[PDB]
Design an enzyme around this catalytic site. Structure first.
Site, PDB file in Angstrom:
ATOM      1  N   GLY A 133      30.547  59.480 -30.416  1.00 64.04           N
ATOM      2  CA  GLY A 133      30.412  58.087 -29.652  1.00 64.04           C
ATOM      3  C   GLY A 133      29.534  58.177 -28.561  1.00 64.04           C
ATOM      4  O   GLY A 133      28.509  58.904 -28.620  1.00 64.04           O
ATOM      5  N   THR A 134      29.940  57.568 -27.445  1.00 59.86           N
ATOM      6  CA  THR A 134      28.905  57.074 -26.396  1.00 59.86           C
ATOM      7  C   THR A 134      29.278  58.072 -25.549  1.00 59.86           C
ATOM      8  O   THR A 134      30.169  58.998 -25.503  1.00 59.86           O
ATOM      9  CB  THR A 134      28.726  55.880 -26.055  1.00 59.86           C
ATOM     10  OG1 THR A 134      30.219  55.649 -25.646  1.00 59.86           O
ATOM     11  CG2 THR A 134      28.428  54.799 -26.846  1.00 59.86           C
TER      12      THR A 134
END
Lengths: 51, 240, 242, 241, 233, 243, 218, 250, 86, 144
Positions: F29-30
Site C-alpha cells: 500500500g501507500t
C-alpha cells in the site's frame, strides 16, 4: 468404484447401499452370538457375552 | 467427484446419486399394477426365501393410506415406512382441514414434495424408494395411478412396472393391455395381472401380494389360496 | 478441479454452466408473442402409450390472463411454481389489481437469483442454487402482450419468440425470419406447429403435443384434442401447397 | 500427513497442535522468574528493548487482573491480550455471583477448563501462551499456579518460563534444600526483590539493567509494578545490607 | 496459479491480494459497459443497454434508487439486485429518521461494509458487480466507482465494462472541458456521447442502445429513452 | 505446505502464513506515518493518485474518533473502512454507558479484543490493515498503531507501508534536532518532508499531501485538517531541502 | 471388441465364428505385442497382416490383453512408453489393410476406457460384444451334448436339471456333468442316477464355485 | 493411514471399530498408571502422580476427588479433561437426582450419567473425546460396593481389579492372579501399594502417591453431632502424612 | 529473474516496435496495462499476434488500435462461449 | 515418436533425433525464408515435445481441434449418403441433431452402422429409422 464418500450418510454409494451399513454387520458378528426363540407359551432368550 | 453433493447439477445434466438410487430398486422388490375402468389392481412381491419367517406378524407390502387410496412401494423397506408414515399424517390432515377424503393428486404432490424438500435441503438425504400411489377421486370411480421417482418428479401412468426386470414385464403390459379399452370386469384385470407377476416371482404363492381397490371406499385382500387360484389358471395352458 | 467460488483466471461459471446443460436436456418449450395474442406450446415427451397426455402438464397457469411455461427439472421447479402462485395472489391481495407481466416476471426472478442458508439483508429460502428456467407470458393494461424468459443466472430478457429446452437452437433458427409484427392469431398457431413438428422426433398429434393460447378476451385457454387436430390438418395443407 | 490435518489425538497418540503450541511460547525468547517470600510474592519478567519507535514503558509481560493477583504471560502477544481481558471478566463475575475473592488456584483452574473449550471448538484456536498466576492467599499464603497450553496446572515453589528453566531450577533447588523451606527470608517485601534479582542473574548468566527488566510486587490487599526508577533503586539496595 | 491455496475468500494469496477480485472483475469486463462524468452543478451517466439477439430486447442497466441519486449496473445481475434493495432501504431510512436524502459518500460506505462482511465470512457469495453512483446532496454532485474488492474512490468520471480504456483516455484530455461547464446540461451530454463512442468499436450506434440519465440541482435524476436520447445521438 | 488453506491453523513458524502474507500486503500500500509530541500527536498519510481524474479532499482517509482522536490506516481500503466504522461504535458504546470521552489506551483494548479474536476464528478473516490512531485524552497524549497480527504497544512514532524503512531513519532524527522534540507546527513541517522522501518508490505516479493533528495548544483538544498557510509552508519547506 | 471372462465369452465366441468361415484360427497374444523396446512395437504389428495378407487363408485373433490396452501416463504403473507408439502406428495398419472380409481382427480386452481413441477410430470397429447372462435354453444345449454319451436314469429329465440354476455359463454346466459322473465312480457304476445330480448341484454352485449370493442389496 | 472415516466421529468406522476410540486409549496409555482393588468390605484405589519440576508442589495435585460421601473416584490422563467432565457430572448428579430424590446419587445411577457425557463427546462433530479414564468406587444399600472402569468411548463395565495407563496390561495379569474376591480391604491396601510400586521405585511416599478407601461411616468427618440416623461420610481420603504410616507397616 | 512487472514490459515492447514497421503513434506505456505475466520471449509472440489484427481491421500497416485488440487475449482461452449473461 | 529429444538420443549416445532438431533450427530459422517454406507438426500433447522447441521463435501457433457443430455434422452425413444407398425422403439435419459433438471417425460410424440395422430388416437402402438406431448405438455403446 474407486471414488467412495463414506463421510456423510446423505451421499449415495455407486452400488446404492451405504458402506456404513455394510461394515456394521461385521461389528455384529464381532460380538457374541445371541439366539432368540419365539414360543407359543412364551419367549426363551439365550445369549453369550463378549467379555 | 460430482456424487458427493446435492447442490451440483453435474456435467451430464443428471445427478449420479439419483441414478444410484435406481440400482437399489432394481435389486429390490417388484411393484406391478394395472388399473381398469371401475377398479385398480396393485401387485407386489414379498420375498419368502428367508426360512422360519412368520407371514402373519409380517406386515404386507401394500399399506393402507386412505379408505379408497392404498400405496405399494418398490425398494428398501427401511426408507419406505417413513414415506408411508409421512403420507398417513397428511392423509389425516386433509380431513382435519378440507374435511374431504384423500385426493390422489394432492397426496402425490405431498409425497413427491417429501423427496423434493429433502433433496433441495443440503446435508439431508432424500428417499430412493419408488412408491406407487393409486386410488379414486372423491365421489368418483375414475382410477388415478401416480408414481414417485428419486429425481423429485411425478408421472401419471395407466400401467407401470418398476423394480427388478422392469423392462421385461413392461413388454407384457404394452401388448395384452389396451388403454383405449381397459378391462371392465375385475376378474379380467386381476387374472392378467397375476401372469405379469409370475415372471419375477417364478411360480410362488406367498411371494405375491395383490390388493384390489373397489369404489365406495372398499379394500379387499386376496388370500394365499385366492392368489394361487389365478396362478393355476395361467399355468393351466402349460399343463394342458 | 472446479471449486465453486474459486475460479480460474478465465472465469466462466460453474452451477450456471451445469444449469445450461440441464435445461437443454429438458422438454422443448416454444412460444411466440404477437399483437393479437400469445401462443405457447410444449413437447410432453410421451415414451409409451400408457403414459397420460393430460394429467401431467409443463404449462402452469399463474393468472387468468397470465400464463407460464416450464422446461427443465420439475423437482426444483415446483418451488418456483408455488412462489409464482403466491406472488399472483400477492398483488391481488395488497393492491387489488392484476400485476403486469414485467412486474410479475421480476418478482418471480427475485427468488431465483438468490440462494444460501446465511441471511444478512434478505430472507433465505433456497438452500442451494436452482437452475430451473421459465417462460412467462401474459397481457397487461400498459405493454399489452409480453413474453419473457426467467433465467436463474442473470436478468430476464424480453423475447418476442423464444424457444428453450432440446428444441432451443433448432427452433430459434427460423424465429429470426418467419416472425413478423403482422402475424395474426391463426398465423401464429400454424407457425408454432410448423416449427414444433421439425424440432420433434415423434409424429405430431394430440397425445405428444399440447399447446395453449393467451389473449385478453379468453384469458388462458388450452387447446383441446379436437381443436389441436384441426390445426394439424391445416398445417399439412399449407406445407403441401408450398 | 493423512491424519495430520486435524487436531485429534492422531494414530500415534500424540497431539501435533501442542507440538507447535509450545514452540510459539519461545518465539519471543523472554525469560521470567517467579519466587515467593514468606508473606509476599515477587515476580520478575524480562522486558525486551525495541527500537526508538516503541515505548518500553508500555511494553509489559505482566498483567494485573486485580489487587494481590497478577499474571505472567510468556508467549505470543495477540493471545496474551485476549486472555488478559478474559481472565479479568471471570475475576469480577466471581466476586459478584459467589461474592468472594477469586484465588489463583481457581483462576488457573478456570483457564484450564476454558482451554479445553478452545480445543472442543474446531473453529477456535487454543491458547498458545504460558499463563502464570501469582497471588497471596489468606490461608495458604503465597502460591504459584502455572497453566500449561495443554491445561495442566500445579503449584510451584519457584517456577520459570523459558529455555533456561533447567538452569534456574538447579540453582533454586539447592537454595531451598539447605534451608528446608520454600520461602525466602527477610520477611520485609523490599528485601525479597533483592534476592529475586540475585538468584535470577546467576541462573540466567546475564546481568540486565533497569530497562531490560520489569519487577512486579504482590502484597496483601495491594499490588503494583515497579517503574524504571524503582527498579534502579532495587539494584542500589542490594549493595546496602 | 492452480489451487495450493484460496479455498474460500478468507485465504490470502502469497502476494497478499485475493484473486477472487480478479475473477469477479472478468464478469464486469464481459458485462455491459457504461461511461459517465459529472460537474459542480450536474452529474450524468450514459449506459449502454445489452441484449442477446435481434429478438431479444435491450435491458436498461440503470435502476432508480433515490430521487436525486442513481447508478448503473455493470457486473453480475444477482449481486446488483440485492444491493439495490439495500441501498434503497438506507435511502428510505435516511429519509425517515434523518429525513435528509442519503449522501453519496455515505451511500458508498454502507455499500462497502455490506460486501465486506460477506467477504471476511467463511464461504459466502461476494458481490462482483461494478457500480457508478451519482447523486446530488447538500455537499454537491459526486461520483463513486465501486469495485468487487469493495474499494470506493472519487473521480470526475470513469468507465467500467468492455473496452473501458478508450473512455479513460478521452477523459484525461477533456478533463478541463466538462468541469468548466455549469448550468448547461446539453454540453455535458454531448461530451458523454462522444466519450462512450471513443471507448467502443462501434458495434451498434442506434438510439435504443444508449441510455442516458442525468441529475442536477434543478432537474432531478431521470432516465431518458426513445426520442429523449435521440436528440444527442 | 497445506497449513495455508484456512485460518485457525498453528504453523511450525509460530505465525500463520496468511498472517505473514497479510503483513506483506501492508507493504504493497501507500505510506502512512505519525509523530507523537508532548502536547499531542501528528498524523501524515500519502494518497496515491491513480490519474488526473482524482478530486482532492475527497478520498482522504483521515477519520476522527469523538473530537479528540484522529484515525488513519495504511492497507486495504475496503477492509480499513470496516474497522473504522466498527471502531467508532466501540468508542461510542463507552460514552453511551460511562458518559465521558474514551481514553486512548482503553480505545486500543476495544480494537484489540475485536481484531485478535478474529485471528483466532476461522469463519472470520483477520484484518490485513494497520490502523494508526491517537490524540489527547484526559490523561494526556497517546499513540497506538494496530498491527494486522493484533499486537500493539505505545509508539513514540508511527511507521507503516512500503516507505516505512526510509521513514524510520527520518523519525529517529527528531532526537538529533531537539532532545524534547519539535513543536506542534514544527512537527507538521518535518513530517511533510518525510512524505516527499518516501515517494521515491512511488514516484511513478503523483500524490496528495494529507496531514492532521490534535493538540491542546491551538485547537484546544480538537482534531482538524491542516490548511491555510500551515499547509503551504510545509510543502515549500521540503522543496527547499530537496534542492 | 470382446468382453466377459475367458473360456466362455472370450474363447467360445472366438472359435465358433472361425468354424463356419472355414478359416484357420490364428491366435496372437496381446501381452506379447509390447516388447518394451523401440522399433519392435510397429514391427510385430505389420507382420501380422503380412502372413494373412497373401491369399487371405486365415483370420487374425487376439485375446487376453492386460498390457497394450493400458498405457497409463508413463512407462511405470502398468503402462509403457512403447505402447503409445505401438497403438498409434497400428491405426495406420487398420486403414491401410483393405479386403472384402476374408481376414478379420478380433481383440479381447476387459476395459476400453484405457484404449487410445485414435486406435479405436469408430466406424472401423462397429462390433461390441457385451457378456450376457445365460438363458434357459443355454443350459439345455450344454446338457444334451454330455447326456448323449452318459446314460441317465428314469428320474432324470431335461426340465429337472434346469429347475434350480444360477444361470451358469456353458462351461460351468459342463463341470456339473463331470461332478455327477464323479459320484458314480464312488458307487462303481457307469450310469449317473438322480441322487448324484442333487448332491452335484450343491457342490458345483457352492463348494466348487464360491458365490453364496451375498444379499441385503449387494 | 488407511481411512480417515474411522477417525471422524460423525462417520462409522470401515474397520468396525472407531479409530478415534482405540487411539484415545493410547493417549490414556501414555499417561501414568492408575489401578483399583474391589474387596468385600471396601474398595481401595492407588495411583502415581506427576513430579514435574523438583520445586513443584506435591500437595497441589489430587487425583482422587469427592463426588458423594459414599462414592470415590480416581483418574489418569489430562488435567482439564477430568475437571470439565466432573464439574458437569456433579451438576447432572445433583439436578437429575438430588433435585428430585433429595439425596446423594447411588453407584449405578451416577456412573451411568458420567458415561453419557463421553457418548456426546464421541458423537457430535468437532468435539474431541476425553483423554482420561475414570475408575469409580462406591457403596450403596442395593448393590453394595462397586468398581466400574469408565473408558473414553463411553462404555463402563464392573471390574474387581483393573488398571489403566501404560501399566494397564502389565498390572491386569498381576491384579488378576494375586487378588481374590473373598479377601478384605486391609489386605487390599497392602497389595495396592506393592503393585503400584512396580511402576516406579523412585519415590513411593505420599508426596507422589495418593491413597483413598471406601467403607463404613466416619463420625469425625460428619461435621455435626447429635443425629444417630444420618451416617457420616463413607469415603475417607488419606492424608499424604498418613500414607507414610501405612507404608511403614507395608 | 521473476516475471517482469507492468512497467518492466513497456520497454521490451518498445524495442519490438522499433524492429518492425509501424505508424510510430504507439505509446508503450499505455499498452503495458493489458499485459499480465509475460516474459521477454512471450512478448515477442504477442507482437506477432498483434499484427494479425491489422488483417481483421483492413489496414496495410499496424496502427496503435491494432495492438489494443491483440494484447488482451485474442487467442483460445474461453473465448465467446460465455459472455454477458448466458 | 521423434520430438526434440528422446531416450536413445537425448539420454542416449546415438544421434538421430538429436541431429533432427538441428535441421529444424539451422535450416528453417537461419537460412530459409519464412514466407515460402513452412513447417507444421501434429501431436497429442504439447508436453511430449522438447521445451526448447516450444519457446517462441520457432513453434508459436497452437491450433486446437474442436468438434463439428449441428451444421458441420450435417454436411458430413450428406456427403457419405452419396456413396451409400439410402431413401430419398430422409433428412440429414435430424440425424446429426440427436448425436452430440463427435470426432471425424465417430461421425463416419453413424453412416457405416446405418447399413447394419438394415440387414436385420432386409432392406437394400437405409431408412431414417436406421440412422436413429445408429446414433443410439454410439450414445449407449460408448457413453464418452
Amino acid at each position: 468404484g474407486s471414488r467412495r464418500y463414506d463421510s456423510r450418510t446423505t451421499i449415495f454409494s455407486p452400488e446404492g447401499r451405504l458402506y456404513q451399513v455394510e461394515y456394521a454387520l461385521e461389528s455384529i458378528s464381532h460380538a457374541g452370538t445371541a439366539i432368540g426363540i419365539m414360543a407359543s407359551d412364551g419367549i426363551v432368550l439365550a445369549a453369550e457375552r463378549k467379555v | 467427484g460430482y456424487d458427493r453433493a446435492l447442490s451440483i447439477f453435474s456435467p451430464d445434466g443428471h445427478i449420479f446419486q439419483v441414478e444410484y438410487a435406481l440400482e437399489a430398486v432394481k435389486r429390490g422388490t417388484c411393484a406391478v399394477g394395472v388399473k381398469g375402468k371401475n377398479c385398480v389392481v396393485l401387485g407386489c412381491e414379498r420375498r419368502s426365501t428367508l426360512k422360519l419367517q412368520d407371514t402373519r406378524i409380517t406386515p404386507s407390502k401394500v399399506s393402507k393410506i386412505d379408505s379408497h387410496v392404498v400405496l405399494s412401494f418398490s425398494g428398501l423397506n427401511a426408507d419406505s415406512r417413513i414415506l408411508i408414515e409421512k403420507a398417513r399424517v397428511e392423509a389425516q390432515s386433509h380431513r382435519l382441514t378440507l374435511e374431504d377424503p384423500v385426493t390422489v393428486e394432492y397426496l402425490t404432490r405431498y409425497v413427491a414434495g417429501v423427496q423434493q424438500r429433502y433433496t433441495q435441503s443440503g446435508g439431508v438425504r432424500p428417499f430412493g424408494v419408488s412408491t406407487l400411489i393409486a386410488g379414486f377421486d372423491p365421489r368418483d370411480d375414475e382410477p388415478k395411478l401416480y408414481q414417485t421417482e428419486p429425481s423429485g418428479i411425478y408421472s401419471s401412468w395407466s400401467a407401470q412396472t418398476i423394480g427388478r426386470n422392469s423392462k421385461t414385464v413392461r413388454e407384457f403390459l404394452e401388448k395384452n393391455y389396451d388403454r383405449k379399452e381397459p378391462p371392465a370386469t375385475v376378474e379380467e384385470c386381476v387374472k392378467l395381472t397375476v401372469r405379469s407377476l409370475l415372471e419375477v416371482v417364478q411360480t410362488g404363492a406367498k411371494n405375491i401380494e395383490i390388493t384390489v381397490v373397489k369404489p365406495d371406499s372398499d379394500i379387499v385382500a386376496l388370500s394365499s389360496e385366492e392368489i394361487n387360484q389365478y396362478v393355476t389358471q395361467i399355468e393351466q395352458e402349460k399343463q394342458e | 478441479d472446479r471449486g465453486v467460488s474459486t475460479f480460474s483466471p478465465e472465469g466462466r461459471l460453474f452451477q450456471v454452466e451445469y444449469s445450461l446443460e440441464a435445461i437443454k436436456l429438458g422438454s422443448t418449450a416454444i412460444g411466440i408473442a404477437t399483437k393479437e395474442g400469445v401462443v405457447l406450446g410444449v413437447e410432453k415427451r410421451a415414451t409409451s402409450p400408457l403414459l397420460e397426455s393430460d394429467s401431467i402438464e409443463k404449462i402452469v397457469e399463474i393468472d387468468r390472463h397470465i400464463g407460464c411455461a416450464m422446461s427443465g427439472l420439475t423437482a426444483d421447479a415446483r418451488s418456483m411454481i408455488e412462489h409464482a402462485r403466491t406472488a399472483a395472489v400477492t398483488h391481488n391481495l395488497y393492491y387489488d389489481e392484476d400485476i403486469n407481466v414485467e412486474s410479475l416476471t421480476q418478482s418471480v426472478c427475485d427468488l431465483a437469483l438468490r440462494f444460501g442458508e446465511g441471511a444478512s439483508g434478505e430472507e433465505r429460502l433456497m438452500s442451494r442454487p436452482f437452475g430451473v428456467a421459465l417462460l412467462i407470458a401474459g397481457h397487461d393494461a400498459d405493454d399489452g402482450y409480453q413474453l419473457f424468459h426467467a433465467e436463474p443466472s442473470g436478468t430476464f430478457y424480453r423475447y418476442n419468440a423464444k424457444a428453450i429446452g432440446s428444441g432451443s437452437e433448432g427452433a430459434q433458427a427460423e424465429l429470426l425470419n418467419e416472425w413478423h409484427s403482422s402475424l395474426t392469431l391463426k398465423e401464429a398457431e400454424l407457425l408454432v406447429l410448423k416449427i414444433l413438428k421439425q424440432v420433434m422426433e415423434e409424429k405430431l398429434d394430440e397425445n405428444n403435443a399440447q399447446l395453449s393460447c393467451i389473449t385478453k378476451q379468453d384469458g388462458f385457454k388450452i387447446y383441446d384434442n379436437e381443436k389441436t387436430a384441426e390445426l394439424i390438418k391445416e398445417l399439412k395443407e399449407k406445407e403441401a401447397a408450398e | 500427513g493423512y491424519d495430520r490435518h486435524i487436531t485429534i489425538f492422531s494414530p500415534e497418540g500424540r497431539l501435533y497442535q501442542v507440538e507447535y503450541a509450545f514452540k510459539a511460547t519461545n518465539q519471543t525468547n523472554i525469560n521470567s522468574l517467579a519466587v515467593r517470600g514468606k508473606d509476599c510474592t515477587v515476580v520478575i519478567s524480562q522486558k525486551k528493548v525495541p527500537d526508538k519507535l516503541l515505548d518500553p514503558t508500555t511494553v509489559s509481560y505482566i498483567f494485573c487482573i486485580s489487587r494481590t493477583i497478577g499474571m505472567v504471560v510468556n508467549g505470543p502477544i495477540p493471545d496474551a491480550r485476549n486472555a488478559a481481558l478474559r481472565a479479568k471478566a471471570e475475576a469480577a463475575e466471581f466476586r459478584y455471583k459467589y461474592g468472594y475473592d477469586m484465588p489463583c488456584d481457581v483462576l488457573a483452574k478456570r483457564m484450564a477448563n476454558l482451554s479445553q473449550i478452545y480445543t472442543q471448538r474446531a473453529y477456535m484456536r487454543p491458547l498458545g501462551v504460558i499463563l502464570t498466576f501469582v497471588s497471596v492467599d489468606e490461608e495458604l499464603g503465597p502460591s504459584i499456579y502455572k497453566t500449561d497450553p495443554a491445561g495442566y496446572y500445579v503449584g510451584y515453589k519457584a517456577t520459570a518460563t523459558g529455555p533456561k528453566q533447567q538452569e534456574i531450577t538447579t540453582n533454586l533447588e539447592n537454595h531451598f534444600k539447605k534451608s528446608k523451606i520454600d520461602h525466602i527470608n527477610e520477611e520485609s517485601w523490599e528485601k525479597v526483590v533483592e534476592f529475586a534479582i540475585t538468584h535470577m542473574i546467576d541462573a540466567l548468566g546475564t546481568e540486565f539493567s533497569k530497562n531490560d527488566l520489569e519487577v512486579g510486587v504482590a502484597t496483601k490487599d495491594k499490588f503494583f509494578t515497579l517503574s524504571a526508577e524503582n527498579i534502579e533503586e532495587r539494584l542500589v539496595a542490594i549493595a546496602e545490607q | 496459479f492452480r489451487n495450493n491455496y484460496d479455498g474460500d475468500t478468507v485465504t490470502f494469496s502469497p502476494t497478499g491480494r485475493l484473486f477472487q477480485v480478479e475473477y469477479a472483475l472478468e464478469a464486469i469486463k464481459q458485462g455491459s459497459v457504461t461511461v459517465g462524468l459529472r460537474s459542480n452543478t450536474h452529474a450524468v451517466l450514459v449506459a449502454l443497454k445489452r441484449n442477446a439477439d435481434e429478438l431479444s430486447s435491450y435491458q436498461k442497466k440503470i435502476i432508480k434508487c433515490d430521487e436525486h441519486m442513481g447508478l448503473s449496473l455493470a457486473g453480475l445481475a444477482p449481486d446488483a439486485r440485492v444491493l439495490s434493495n439495500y441501498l434503497r432501504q438506507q435511502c428510505n431510512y435516511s429519509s425517515l429518521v434523518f429525513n435528509r436524502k442519503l449522501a453519496v459518500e455515505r451511500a458508498g460506505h454502507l455499500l462497502c461494509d455490506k460486501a465486506q462482511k460477506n467477504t471476511q465470512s467463511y464461504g459466502g457469495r461476494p458481490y462482483g458487480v461494478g457500480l457508478l453512483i451519482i447523486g446530488y446532496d447538500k455537499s454537491g454532485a459526486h461520483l463513486l466507482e465501486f469495485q468487487p474488492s469493495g474499494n470506493v474512490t472519487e473521480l470526475y468520471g470513469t468507465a467500467i465494462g468492455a473496452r473501458s480504456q478508450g473512455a479513460k483516455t478521452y477523459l484525461e484530455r477533456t478533463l478541463d472541458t466538462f468541469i468548466k461547464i455549469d448550468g448547461n446540461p446539453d454540453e455535458l451530454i454531448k461530451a458523454g456521447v462522444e466519450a462512450i463512442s471513443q471507448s467502443l468499436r462501434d458495434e451498434s450506434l442506434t438510439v435504443d442502445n444508449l441510455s442516458i440519465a442525468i441529475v442536477g440541482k434543478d432537474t432531478p435524476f431521470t432516465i431518458y429513452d426513445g426520442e429523449a436520447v435521440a436528440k444527442y445521438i | 505446505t497445506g497449513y495455508d488453506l484456512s485460518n485457525s491453523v498453528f504453523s511450525p513458524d509460530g505465525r500463520n502464513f496468511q498472517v505473514e502474507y497479510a503483513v506483506k500486503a501492508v507493504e504493497n500500500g501507500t505510506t502512512s506515518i505519525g509523530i507523537k509530541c508532548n502536547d499531542g500527536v501528528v498524523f501524515a498519510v500519502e494518497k496515491l493518485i491513480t490519474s488526473k481524474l482524482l478530486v482532492p479532499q475527497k478520498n482522504v482517509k483521515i477519520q476522527v474518533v469523538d473530537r479528540h482522536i484522529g484515525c488513519v490506516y495504511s492497507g486495504l481500503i475496503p477492509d480499513g473502512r470496516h474497522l473504522v466504522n466498527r471502531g467508532r461504535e466501540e468508542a461510542a458504546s463507552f460514552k453511551k454507558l460511562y458518559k465521558t470521552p474514551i481514553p486512548i489506551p482503553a480505545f486500543a483494548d476495544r480494537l484489540g479484543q475485536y481484531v485478535q479474536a478474529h485471528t483466532l476464528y476461522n469463519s472470520v478473516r483477520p484484518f490485513g490493515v494497520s490502523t494508526i490512531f491517537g490524540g489527547v485524552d484526559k490523561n494526556g497524549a497517546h499513540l497506538y498503531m494496530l498491527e494486522p497480527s493484533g499486537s500493539y504497544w505505545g509508539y513514540k512514532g508511527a511507521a507503516t507501508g512500503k516507505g516505512r524503512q526510509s521513514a524510520k531513519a527520518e523519525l529517529e532524527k527528531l532526537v538529533d534536532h531537539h532532545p524534547e522534540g519539535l513543536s506542534a507546527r514544527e512537527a507538521v513541517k518535518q513530517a511533510a518532508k518525510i512524505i516527499y522522501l518516501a515517494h521515491e518508490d512511488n514516484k511513478e505516479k503523483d500524490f496528495e499531501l494529507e496531514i492532521s493533528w490534535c493538540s491542546l495548544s491551538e485547537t484546544n483538544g480538537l482534531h482538524k485538517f491542516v490548511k491555510g498557510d500551515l499547509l503551504q509552508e510545509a510543502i515549500d519547506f521540503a522543496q527547499k531541502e530537496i534542492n | 471388441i470382446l468382453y466377459g471372462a475367458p473360456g466362455t465369452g472370450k474363447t467360445l465366441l472366438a472359435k465358433a465364428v472361425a468354424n463356419q468361415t472355414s478359416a484357420t484360427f490364428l491366435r496372437i497374444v496381446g501381452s506379447e505385442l509390447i516388447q518394451k523396446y523401440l522399433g519392435d512395437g510397429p514391427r510385430l504389428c505389420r507382420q501380422i497382416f503380412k502372413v494373412a495378407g497373401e491369399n487371405a487363408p486365415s483370420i487374425v485373433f487376439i485375446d487376453e490383453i492386460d498390457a497394450i490396452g493400458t498405457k497409463r501416463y508413463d512407462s511405470n504403473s502398468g503402462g509403457e512408453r512403447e505402447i503409445q507408439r505401438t497403438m498409434l502406428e497400428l491405426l495406420n495398419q487398420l486403414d491401410g489393410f483393405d479386403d472384402r472380409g476374408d481376414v478379420k481382427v478380433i481383440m479381447a480386452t476387459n476395459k476400453i476406457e484405457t484404449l487410445d481413441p485414435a486406435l479405436i477410430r469408430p466406424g472401423r470397429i462397429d462390433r461390441k460384444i457385451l457378456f450376457e447372462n445365460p438363458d434357459l435354453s443355454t443350459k439345455k444345449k450344454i446338457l444334451g451334448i454330455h447326456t448323449s454319451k452318459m446314460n441317465l436314469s428314469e428320474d432324470v429329465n431335461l426340465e429337472t436339471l434346469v429347475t434350480t440354476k444360477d444361470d451358469l455359463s456353458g462351461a460351468d454346466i459342463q463341470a456339473m456333468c463331470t461332478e455327477a459322473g464323479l459320484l458314480a465312480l464312488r458307487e462303481r457304476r457307469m450310469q449317473v442316477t438322480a441322487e448324484d445330480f442333487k448332491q452335484a448341484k450343491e457342490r458345483v454352485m457352492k463348494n466348487k464355485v464360491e458365490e453364496n449370493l451375498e444379499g441385503l442389496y449387494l | 493411514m488407511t481411512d480417515r472415516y474411522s477417525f471422524s466421529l460423525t462417520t462409522f468406522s470401515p474397520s468396525g471399530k472407531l479409530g478415534q476410540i482405540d487411539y484415545a486409549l493410547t493417549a490414556v496409555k501414555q499417561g501414568v498408571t492408575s489401578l483399583g482393588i474391589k474387596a468385600t468390605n471396601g474398595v481401595v484405589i492407588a495411583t502415581e502422580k506427576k513430579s514435574s519440576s523438583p520445586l513443584a508442589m506435591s500437595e497441589t495435585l489430587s487425583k482422587v476427588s469427592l463426588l458423594t460421601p459414599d462414592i470415590g473416584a480416581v483418574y489418569s490422563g489430562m488435567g482439564p479433561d477430568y475437571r470439565v467432565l466432573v464439574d458437569k457430572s456433579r451438576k447432572v448428579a445433583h439436578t437429575s437426582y438430588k433435585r428430585i430424590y433429595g439425596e446423594y446419587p447411588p453407584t449405578k445411577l451416577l456412573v451411568s450419567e458420567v458415561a453419557k457425557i463421553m457418548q456426546e463427546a464421541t458423537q457430535s462433530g468437532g468435539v474431541r473425546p476425553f483423554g482420561v479414564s475414570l475408575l469409580i468406587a462406591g457403596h450403596d444399600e442395593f448393590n453394595g460396593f462397586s468398581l466400574y472402569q469408565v473408558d473414553p468411548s463411553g462404555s463402563y463395565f464392573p471390574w474387581k481389579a483393573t488398571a489403566i495407563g501404560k501399566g494397564s496390561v502389565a498390572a491386569k495379569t498381576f491384579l488378576e492372579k494375586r487378588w481374590n474376591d473373598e479377601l478384605e480391604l486391609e489386605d487390599a491396601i497392602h497389595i495396592a501399594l506393592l503393585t503400584l510400586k512396580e511402576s516406579v521405585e523412585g519415590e513411593f511416599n505420599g508426596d507422589t502417591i495418593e491413597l483413598a478407601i471406601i467403607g463404613d461411616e466416619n463420625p469425625d468427618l460428619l461435621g455435626y453431632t447429635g443425629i444417630p440416623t444420618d451416617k457420616g461420610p463413607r469415603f475417607r481420603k488419606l492424608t499424604s502424612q498418613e500414607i507414610n504410616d501405612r507404608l511403614e507397616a507395608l | 529473474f521473476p516475471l517482469p512487472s507492468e512497467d518492466s514490459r513497456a520497454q521490451i515492447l518498445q524495442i519490438h516496435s522499433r524492429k518492425m514497421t509501424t505508424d510510430d503513434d504507439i505509446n508503450w506505456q499505455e499498452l503495458a496495462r493489458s499485459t499480465d505475466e509475460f516474459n521477454g520471449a512471450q512478448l515477442k509472440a504477442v507482437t506477432v499476434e498483434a499484427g494479425m489484427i491489422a488483417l481483421r481491421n483492413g489496414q496495410s500497416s499496424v496502427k496503435h488500435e491494432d495492438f489494443v485488440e491483440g494484447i488482451s487475449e485474442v487467442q483460445a482461452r474461453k473465448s465467446k462461449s460465455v459472455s454477458f449473461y448466458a | 515418436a521423434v520430438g526434440g529429444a528422446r531416450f536413445d538420443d537425448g539420454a542416449g549416445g546415438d544421434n538421430e533425433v538429436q541431429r533432427t532438431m538441428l535441421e529444424l533450427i539451422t535450416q528453417l530459422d537461419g537460412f530459409d525464408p519464412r514466407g515460402n517454406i513452412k513447417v507444421m507438426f501434429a501431436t497429442n500433447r504439447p508436453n511430449t515435445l522438447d521445451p526448447a522447441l516450444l519457446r517462441p521463435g520457432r513453434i508459436d501457433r497452437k491450433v486446437e481441434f474442436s468438434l463439428p457443430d449441428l451444421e458441420g455434422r450435417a454436411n458430413i452425413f450428406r456427403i457419405h449418403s452419396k456413396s451409400m444407398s439410402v431413401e430419398r425422403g430422409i433428412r440429414w439435419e435430424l440425424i446429426s441433431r440427436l448425436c452430440p459433438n463427435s470426432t471425424g471417425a465417430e461421425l463416419r460410424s453413424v453412416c457405416t452402422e446405418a447399413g447394419m440395422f438394415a440387414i436385420r430388416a432386409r432392406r437394400k437402402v437405409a431408412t431414417e429409422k436406421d440412422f436413429l438406431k445408429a446414433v443410439d448405438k454410439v450414445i449407449s455403446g460408448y457413453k464418452k
